[PDB]
């Protein structure tokens, strides 16, 4: 059946860095953007809502505005990759990626953020 997988279900990230978290989904030949849905969320917060090839930014949570990007070039490889820049302490938690292309699935990914500490 249609299955999403995660290479890594835990990312440990430095405060202030950029992170790219990924989920894999099955692709064959044409990927019809009309039929594809990619959604990323954390807690009650929408991050990406990519539907019929368009992102709805109206629904995106304010904390991710101008910080969050779907790497849409990765989609032909079967990779829904979310890049978050300038990672905050508040970015730590459980993220969900949901992909629909006929069938639908999701997975969890945990992000831990290391607070700034001088060696």
């Amino acid at each position: 059946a249609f299955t999403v997988t995660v290479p890594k279900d835990l990312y440990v990230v430095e405060y202030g860095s950029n992170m790219t978290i990924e989920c894999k989904f099955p692709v064959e030949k044409q990927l019809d953007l009309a039929a594809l849905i990619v959604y990323w969320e954390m807690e009650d917060k929408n991050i990406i809502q990519f539907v019929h090839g368009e992102e709805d930014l109206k629904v995106q949570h304010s904390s991710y505005r101008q910080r969050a990007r779907l790497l849409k070039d990765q989609l032909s490889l079967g990779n829904a990759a979310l890049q978050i820049t300038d990672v905050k302490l508040q970015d730590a938690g459980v993220y969900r990626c949901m992909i629909s292309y006929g069938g639908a699935d999701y997975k969890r990914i945990t992000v831990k953020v290391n607070a700034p500490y001088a060696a």
């Binding site: 969900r96 949901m98 629909s100 639908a104 999701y106």
Partner: peptide, 13 residues
């Protein structure tokens, strides 16, 4: 959309 996977719900907007 309103999609349910393993008793978790995903909804637009």
């Amino acid at each position: 959309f309103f999609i349910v996977i393993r008793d978790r719900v995903f909804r637009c907007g």
